[PDB]
Amino acid sequence: ERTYLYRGRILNLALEGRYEIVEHKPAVAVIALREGRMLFVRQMRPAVGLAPLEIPAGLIEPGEDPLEAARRELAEETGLSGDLTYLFSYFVSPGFTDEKTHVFLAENLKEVEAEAIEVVWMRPEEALERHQRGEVEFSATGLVGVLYYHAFLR
């Protein structure tokens, strides 16, 4: 039995007995490789005070399913379209939030549309090296993209 403390724009804060629970819209993220570069994006994220390396990601809006949201945010954030394949999903931090991320692969990318969101094409090997040297932070989606590449796309 959830009692609500806050109903907001992209989250609700609830108590469920002793548990603090943040309800959040589901998200999507897209892994895309071109000429050995992965498609990352960076934007200022006020929650962390910096711009981590992410892959294109967004929230699922009313009416959409994950595939449609993935197509939309790839086009909105990078101007690209591709052939999308569902990979897997994960709960970002299920000890306090229900946010679930659905991750897709994009292939055969084409420009459909010509630095709020900065597009950062970067070899995943270099992203991993920059992170190990302390030069860039990852979001979960960025790290999942780099690990998925090393596991399956070489």
Ligand X SMILES: Nc1ncnc2c1ncn2[C@@H]1O[C@H](COP(=O)(O)OP(=O)(O)OC[C@H]2O[C@H](O)[C@H](O)[C@@H]2O)[C@@H](O)[C@H]1O
77 appears as a binding residue in the annotation: yes
Tell me the residue number closest to Mn ion, measured at CB: 58
Q: Which residues bind ligand X (CB under 6 A)?
A: 9-10, 18-21, 27, 47, 57-59, 73, 93-96, 99, 139, 141
137 labeled part of a ligand binding site: no
Interface residue with its own copies among 28, 105, 106, 148 (CB under 8 A) is 148
d(CA 97, CA 70): 21
Q: What is the 8-class DSSP label of residue 61?
A: P
106 is in an annotated binding site: no
- Rounded to whole angstroms, the Cα distance separating 12 from 118 reads 29
In contact, 149 and 33? CB cutoff 8 Å = yes
Q: What angle do CA 100, 56, 144 make, to 5 degrees?
A: 60
Q: Which of 67, 68, 79, 92 binds its own copies (CB under 8 A)?
A: 92
- In the window 51-110, what residues touch Mn ion (CB under 5 A)? 58
